[PDB]
Every structure is written in C-alpha cells, then in structure tokens.
Amino acid sequence: TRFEKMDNLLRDPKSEVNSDCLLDGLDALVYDLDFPALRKNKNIDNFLSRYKDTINKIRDLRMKAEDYEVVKVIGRGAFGEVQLVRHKSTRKVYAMKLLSKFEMIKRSDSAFFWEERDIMAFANSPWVVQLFYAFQDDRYLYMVMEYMPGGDLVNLMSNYDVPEKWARFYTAEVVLALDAIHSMGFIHRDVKPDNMLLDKSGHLKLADFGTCMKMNKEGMVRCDTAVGTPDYISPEVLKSYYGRECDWWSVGVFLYEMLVGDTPFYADSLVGTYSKIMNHKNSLTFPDDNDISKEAKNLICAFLTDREVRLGRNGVEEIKRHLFFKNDQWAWETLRDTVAPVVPDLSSDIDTSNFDDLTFPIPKAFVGNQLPFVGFTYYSNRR
Amino acid sequence: FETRFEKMDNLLRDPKSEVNSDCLLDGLDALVYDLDFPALRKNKNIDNFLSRYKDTINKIRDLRMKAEDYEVVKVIGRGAFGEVQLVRHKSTRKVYAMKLLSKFEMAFFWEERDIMAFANSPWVVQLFYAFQDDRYLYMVMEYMPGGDLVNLMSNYDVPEKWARFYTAEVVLALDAIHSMGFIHRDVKPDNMLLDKSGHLKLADFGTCMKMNKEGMVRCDTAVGTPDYISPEVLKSQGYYGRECDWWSVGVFLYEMLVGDTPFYADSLVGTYSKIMNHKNSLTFPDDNDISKEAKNLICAFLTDREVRLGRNGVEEIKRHLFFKNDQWAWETLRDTVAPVVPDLSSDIDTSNFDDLEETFPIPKAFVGNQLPFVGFTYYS
Ligand SMILES: O=C(NCc1cccc2c1OCCO2)c1ccc(-c2ccncc2)cc1
Ligand SMILES: O=C(NCc1cccc2c1OCCO2)c1ccc(-c2ccncc2)cc1
Numbered sequence: 001t002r003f004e005k006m007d008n009l010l011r012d013p014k015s016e017v018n019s020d021c022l023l024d025g026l027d028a029l030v031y032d033l034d035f036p037a038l039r040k041n042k043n044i045d046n047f048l049s050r051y052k053d054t055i056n057k058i059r060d061l062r063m064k065a066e067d068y069e070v071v072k073v074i075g076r077g078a079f080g081e082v083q084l085v086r087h088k089s090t091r092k093v094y095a096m097k098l099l100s101k102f103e104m105i106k107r108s109d110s111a112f113f114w115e116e117r118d119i120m121a122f123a124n125s126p127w128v129v130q131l132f133y134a135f136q137d138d139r140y141l142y143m144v145m146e147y148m149p150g151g152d153l154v155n156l157m158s159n160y161d162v163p164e165k166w167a168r169f170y171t172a173e174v175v176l177a178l179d180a181i182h183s184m185g186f187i188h189r190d191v192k193p194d195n196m197l198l199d200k201s202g203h204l205k206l207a208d209f210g211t212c213m214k215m216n217k218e219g220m221v222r223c224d225t226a227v228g229t230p231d232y233i234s235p236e237v238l239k240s241y242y243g244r245e246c247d248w249w250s251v252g253v254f255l256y257e258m259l260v261g262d263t264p265f266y267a268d269s270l271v272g273t274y275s276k277i278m279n280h281k282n283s284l285t286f287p288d289d290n291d292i293s294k295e296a297k298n299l300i301c302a303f304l305t306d307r308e309v310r311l312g313r314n315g316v317e318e319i320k321r322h323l324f325f326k327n328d329q330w331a332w333e334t335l336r337d338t339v340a341p342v343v344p345d346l347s348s349d350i351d352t353s354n355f356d357d358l359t360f361p362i363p364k365a366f367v368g369n370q371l372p373f374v375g376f377t378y379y380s381n382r383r
Numbered sequence: 384f385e386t387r388f389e390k391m392d393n394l395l396r397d398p399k400s401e402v403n404s405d406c407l408l409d410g411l412d413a414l415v416y417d418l419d420f421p422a423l424r425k426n427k428n429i430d431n432f433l434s435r436y437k438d439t440i441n442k443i444r445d446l447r448m449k450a451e452d453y454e455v456v457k458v459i460g461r462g463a464f465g466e467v468q469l470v471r472h473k474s475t476r477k478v479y480a481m482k483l484l485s486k487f488e489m490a491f492f493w494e495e496r497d498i499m500a501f502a503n504s505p506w507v508v509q510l511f512y513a514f515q516d517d518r519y520l521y522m523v524m525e526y527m528p529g530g531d532l533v534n535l536m537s538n539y540d541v542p543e544k545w546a547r548f549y550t551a552e553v554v555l556a557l558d559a560i561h562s563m564g565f566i567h568r569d570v571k572p573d574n575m576l577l578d579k580s581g582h583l584k585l586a587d588f589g590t591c592m593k594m595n596k597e598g599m600v601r602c603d604t605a606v607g608t609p610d611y612i613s614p615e616v617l618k619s620q621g622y623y624g625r626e627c628d629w630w631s632v633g634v635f636l637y638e639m640l641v642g643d644t645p646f647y648a649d650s651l652v653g654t655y656s657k658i659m660n661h662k663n664s665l666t667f668p669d670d671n672d673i674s675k676e677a678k679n680l681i682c683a684f685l686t687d688r689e690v691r692l693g694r695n696g697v698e699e700i701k702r703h704l705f706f707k708n709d710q711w712a713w714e715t716l717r718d719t720v721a722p723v724v725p726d727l728s729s730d731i732d733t734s735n736f737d738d739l740e741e742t743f744p745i746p747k748a749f750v751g752n753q754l755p756f757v758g759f760t761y762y763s
Contacts, residue, residue, distance in 0.1 A: 006446050006447065009443070019395050019404065022411060026410050029563065041751060043754045044754065047751070061387055062391060073668055089384035366748070368428040372428055372431055
C-alpha cells in the first residue's frame with residue numbers, strides 16, 4: 001500500500017508530472033480538440049462535451065492574463081514583451097514576460113523558456129530576478145517576476161558618465177551574479193547591460209536566461225551554432241566545446257563600454273563587429289584622451305583576451321583579487337549590504353521613470369500545438 | 384485569490400470531482416495510449432511530447448492500481464460487455480467481486496460507478512475502487528456471498544412470509560436509490576444480491592438514469608428483456624418517474640408466489656404485447672395460495688402509472704395491508720434475522736453462484752479511443 005510515492009510525484013514542484021503538469025495536460029487536450037473539423041469524431045465530440053463545464057471552471061479558477069491589470073509595456077523581445085502588471089485581487093506589482101507560442105514554434109531554434117523558468121523559480125539568489133508564477137493559455141506562455149524599478153544598465157549608461165568607482169561596483173555585482181549562476185551549473189552565454197537590472201535600493205540582479213545552458217561533467221558546452229549578442233560574444237562562442245570563461249569576456253566588454261562610452265569592437269556594419277572581435281588582438285584600443293587608470297585597462301585587457309589566457313580560467317578568486325577591485329567603500333562579502341552608486345527615487349509602486357515608454361492556424365486533422373508547453377505552469381506546485 | 388487557490392487545491396482531492404488527480408492522470412495516460420503509433424510519431428509535437436512523458440507515465444502505471452494486483456479466483460457472473468469475477472487482493476489477502484467492461488466491445492457505466500461509490504447505503508453494493516488498463520474498465524465491489532434472487536427462486540417455492548421480507552427490502556433499497564436522485568427502470572432478481580447475513584443489496588446499475596428538475600427520465604435506447612419493465616418505459620422511444628420502479632416490484636412479488644412472471648410469453652415481442660395489454664393479460668392462477676393482501680399489493684403495482692401505489696410516495700406502499708406483520712418493523716428491518724442465512728465454508732466460497740468458464744485496430748489518424756474512459760479511476 002505504497003500509494004504515498006504517487007502523491008510525492010504529484011506534489012513535488014520539480015516533478016515532471018505534478019498537479020500543475022496534470023492540469024496543463026487536460027487544458028492542452030481540450031485546446032487541441034475544440035475545432036469543428038475534429039469535432040466530426042464521435043470520440044472527440046463526446047469527451048469535449050462531457051469535460052466542457054469543468055474545463056471552464058478550471059480555466060477561470062486557475063491563473064490567467066485577465067487576473068492582471070497591465071500598466072505599461074516596459075520591454076520588447078524576439079517572441080514577446082515584458083509588461084508592468086498589477087494583480088487585480090492581490091494588488092501586488094510584477095513584471096510579466098509574455099512569449100508567443102506560434103512565433104517560438106515558427107522562429108525559435110530551442111525550448112529556451114524551460115531553463116529560464118527554472119533559473120528564475122529555484123535560483124533563490126539575491127543576484128537572480130525571481131519567478132512567483134508561471135502560467136499559459138491558447139496563445140502565450142507567461143512569466144510573473146519581481147519588478148526591478150531602477151531599470152537596466154543600458155539606461156544608466158546613457159543617462160550618466162560612469163566613473164571608475166561606479167563601474168567597479170557594477171562589475172563586482174555582475175561577477176558575483178555570474179559566480180552564482182556558474183555555481184548553479186549554468187553558463188550565461190549572453191552577458192550584457194540589457195540583462196543587468198536594478199532594484200528599488202539600486203542593486204544588480206540578472207534577468208534574461210534565454211541563452212543559459214547546463215554545463216556537462218567538465219563544466220563545458222558542445223555547440224554547433226553561436227548564441228548571444230554581436231558586441232559581447234567571445235571569439236570561441238562565435239567560431240563554433242567552451243567553458244564558463246566565455247561569460248568573463250562579456251564582462252570585459254561591459255567594463256570597456258562603461259568607461260570609454262562605446263563597445264570595444266564597434267563597427268558601422270553589424271558584420272564588421274564580427275571581423276573586429278576575431279581580430280581582438282589588433283582592434284582592442286583605448287582612445288587618445290586616456291583618463292582611464294592603468295589598473296582599469298589591466299582588468300579590461302586580462303578579460304578581452306583568448307579563452308586559454310583569460311582571467312578567471314583558474315576560478316573567480318583570480319578576478320576578485322584584481323587590484324582594480326580594491327576600494328574604500330565595500331569588500332566582496334559585504335557588497336550587497338553597502339549603498340549603491342545610483343539610489344533611485346520612485347514616485348509610486350508602479351514608477352516606470354527608468355524605463356523607455358513603449359496566432360496558430362485552425363487545423364484540419366489533429367496537430368497538437370499545445371503539447372510542447374505541457375508542464376510550464378508553476379502555480380499549484382511551487383517551493 | 385487565496386479562495387481561488389484553495390478551491391483549485393481542494394478540487395484536486397475531491398473524489399466526487401471530475402478533476403481529481405486520478406482523473407487528471409487518466410487523461411494523461413490516455414493521451415499516451417492514443418498517440419504512441421508509428422503514423423502519429425511523424426508529427427514532431429506528438430513525437431517529442433511522447434519521448435518526454437513515456438517513461439514517467441509508465442512509472443505512474445506501475446504505482447497505480449493494475450489488474451495484476453489481484454488473483455482471479457472464479458468467474459462468478461457474466462454480462463453483455465464482460466464478467467464479474469471473484470478476486471483477492473494479492474497484498475491485502477481480502478476478497479472482492481470485481482466487474483469488467485470491455486473498452487473495445489463498448490456511457491452507462493458513469494451512473495453505475497457514482498451510485499456504488501457514493502450511495503453510502505446498507506442497501507447498495509459498495510464500490511471500493513474503479514480502475515483501468517488499455518482494454519478494460521475494472522470496478523472493485525464488496526462481495527455478496529448469498530448470491531442473487533434467481534438462485535433463491537430456483538432452490539425454493541418461496542413462501543409468502545419470505546416474499547414479504549424480500550419485497551420490503553426492495554422497497555427500501557429502491558427508495559434509497561430514488562432519494563439519491565435515480566430511477567432504476569429495470570429492477571429484476573438478477574440485481575437483488577444477498578450478503579453473509581442473507582440481507583438484500585441492489586447491484587446492476589447500468590439501467591439507472593439521473594432524474595431531471597421535476598424528477599423524471601426520458602430515454603431513446605433499446606429496452607432488452609421486457610419481462611420486468613413497466614408499460615411507460617416500453618412506450619418510450621416520452622417522460623416517466625418513481626412509479627415505474629414500483630411496477631417492476633409488483634412483477635417480482637408475482638414471480639416469487641406464482642413461479643413465472645405475469646406477462647411471460649414464449650417471445651420477446653409476445654411479452655411486450657402482454658405488457659401493453661396488461662389490464663387484460665394479468666391473470667391469477669386457478670388454485671393459488673396467494674393472500675388477499677398479497678393479491679391486492681400486486682394489482683396496485685400492476686396498473687397504469689396514473690393509478691399506481693407509490694405515485695404519492697413510498698409511505699403509501701409501506702402502509703399496505705400486506706406488510707402488516709409481527710416478525711419485523713420497517714425502521715429496524717435490516718436488523719432482523721433474514722429467512723435464508725448463508726452457511727459459508729471460507730472467504731472464497733461460491734456455493735450460491737452458478738459455475739462459470741477482440742482488439743482495437745492499429746490506426747493511421749488520431750482516433751481517440753481512450754477518451755470516453757478519461758475520469759473512470761476512483762480510489763478510497
Ligand atoms: O529577458 C527579458 N527580455 C527579453 C525578451 C522579452 C520578451 C520576449 C523575448 C525576450 O528575449 C528572448 C526573445 O523573446 C526581460 C526584460 C526585462 C525584465 C524585467 C525584470 C524586472 N523588472 C523589469 C523588467 C525581465 C526580462
Ligand atoms: O452488473 C452486474 N452484472 C451485469 C454485467 C456484468 C458484467 C458485464 C456486463 C454486465 O451487464 C451489462 C454490461 O456488461 C453484476 C452482477 C453481480 C455482481 C455482484 C456483486 C457483489 N457480489 C457478487 C456479485 C456485480 C455486478
């Protein structure tokens with residue numbers, strides 16, 4: 001009488017077939033059948049009519065988009081948008097990411113949303129933006145995260161001239177956030193200011209995990225295709241078996257851009273950037289007016305080098321030990337407790353002052369377009 | 384929100400709910416059966432979903448109730464879509480009567496499962512579990528070792544005092560079914576099972592239907608053996624209620640005291656005709672040993688629904704002169720000693736039961752064969 005194991009498999013928030021996954025299965029089934037063409041099947045019609053009432057009960061009882069008041073669209077992406085939302089009942093504020101099932105089916109080359117949900121739902125790090133709920137519908141996937149009112153690092157870099165002390169803080173927090181992600185067993189693969197967000201008290205948290213890959217037995221990744229951003233992509237990830245050190249190159253690019261005011265491998269043509277990155281040894285130069293310290297250019301150059309040579313090849317302590325990080329404000333351990341360079345000032349809980357103001361074809365035969373999303377919802381069984 | 388979260392959660396464990404985890408797991412293991420074929424694995428969605436949940440659902444299959452958790456002792460009954468077999472739970476070493484319905488050979492089973500599982504009456508055979516595999520639907524019940532009333536009528540020339548007891552028990556067991564919101568439609572001895580104390584419990588509910596707003600039923604489906612069926616259900620191709628189950632009772636009282644049904648005819652069509660012509664065909668034998676009281680109680684039930692004893696409620700029935708006796712009182716009837724009490728050898732004794740002794744076709748398109756059985760599973 002070991003029916004106990006059953007309930008565990010049905011209640012564990014990490015289980016492949018918990019209540020969330022079960023409820024998703026039925027929801028998907030009723031979605032992939034309710035088409036007049038398919039309803040010409042007696043087996044299909046009956047089930048549908050018998051389950052009609054309860055599926056409606058369930059759909060309205062479970063989480064859905066109409067439970068959220070959408071305040072403003074505070075972000076856009078390849079397959080959707082990030083909207084600042086307010087939960088009508090609970091009055092709480094969150095950033096909700098939307099993903100189009102149709103778009104992703106048509107253009108995405110991976111099931112990126114799975115590891116992204118899991119990094120945000122279980123990371124339990126002050127360096128990772130957390131997930132509260134994950135849900136879906138006929139059209140979209142939904143990710144309910146904590147709102148980061150201070151905006152991103154692209155906004156900060158534009159609004160201000162970043163001094164070395166400010167740069168030292170932001171670099172240092174990204175180093176800890178990346179060490180947290182590596183400790184969790186992933187490689188970021190796409191580190192950039194777009195993915196660096198700021199909290200109400202001005203501390204960094206990472207936010208786009210669409211390029212995260214689990215490391216193998218030797219902390220490595222076998223890849224055919226290149227992933228990331230044309231400016232911040234390391235020479236290895238571009239040429240396409242790499243390690244965590246790729247994320248550190250992107251940190252070099254991130255430091256260089258904050259101090260110099262432009263990316264180290266800029267080109268007028270987007271393709272010209274590629275040529276430049278490959279020629280990093282003869283394209284990495286600092287402007288004539290060299291106001292940047294000797295210690296700062298040192299860190300930059302110790303990262304903006306070949307995979308084998310790169311600082312952090314022999315662990316993160318090598319990075320922390322760099323002279324550039326020595327300062328009168330914080331120490332690595334006390335960093336997220338110290339005061340931030342830019343402490344914002346927010347009008348309300350919905351203050352968007354740091355953010356720029358902004359389907360599937362009906363089938364003939366059974367296709368099952370909701371089947372590759374079964375298991376996404378993180379509502380009934382969470383930790 | 385907190386209420387909407389809790390509703391959904393309470394729902395996942397409510398056994399009377401269409402979305403209890405067992406029903407949700409049903410739909411999932413059903414989706415795997417109905418899609419795991421070479422033709423359908425040519426669709427990346429279908430192929431990938433299957434690859435993803437194949438091994439974990441077969442893990443689920445292994446933990447959940449399966450037929451091979453039971454040792455099949457003897458086939459103690461047979462029916463139009465399977466058989467009733469005496470079974471013992473391999474672990475528990477406990478004995479049950481478990482009914483089988485063939486998926487391939489086959490909706491009627493929904494009301495049979497709910498009545499048995501949720502009646503909670505000493506008059507209804509209990510359903511402990513309801514499960515399923517690819518081919519059959521299993522229904523695990525409490526085993527009734529006294530056998531049916533067919534067997535009783537074979538081994539005795541049923542005396543009146545015995546007839547009265549068994550009649551009063553069908554009256555009470557039907558009223559319990561009536562109070563649950565169902566009409567039987569075809570209550571016959573084959574349905575009247577006897578327990579270790581020789582007391583009644585109704586058992587074949589495939590003929591049952593849920594009453595409407597005004598407490599009535601309408602049906603289009605074929606009748607079968609008309610013998611115990613009322614003229615109203617026979618007229619229906621049309622609404623009727625309560626009173627039809629009382630006609631059946633009157634047939635059963637006539638059988639016990641006369642040896643044959645009142646409208647028996649050599650043919651099915653011939654019987655039906657005698658039922659329609661009931662106010663001319665109903666005859667009492669030349670030298671019957673039937674009471675004045677028993678004869679009135681038959682005719683009262685064997686009349687048009689408009690003038691039938693029981694139209695105005697069960698108490699009109701209960702107050703009848705026939706039921707006047709010193710050996711029992713309606714409210715403590717099941718408490719008195721039954722006229723026939725089984726003398727059983729062991730837990731697997733089948734002395735009171737007669738001795739007793741095809742595939743889905745591999746398809747091209749999504750057929751969805753398992754879909755009508757989604758939600759059959761029930762535990763306790
Ligand atoms: O990853 C993000 N956007 C990328 C993105 C958005 C939509 C579709 C995408 C896509 O990327 C891959 C293609 O499909 C993202 C941006 C901002 C926040 C955020 C967090 C907290 N507070 C305010 C804002 C959270 C996430
Ligand atoms: O429903 C029954 N028989 C009818 C029948 C049996 C199988 C398949 C059928 C069918 O009818 C039409 C569909 O296919 C039934 C009879 C006896 C018991 C019983 C219970 C407890 N103890 C001993 C015996 C349980 C069930």
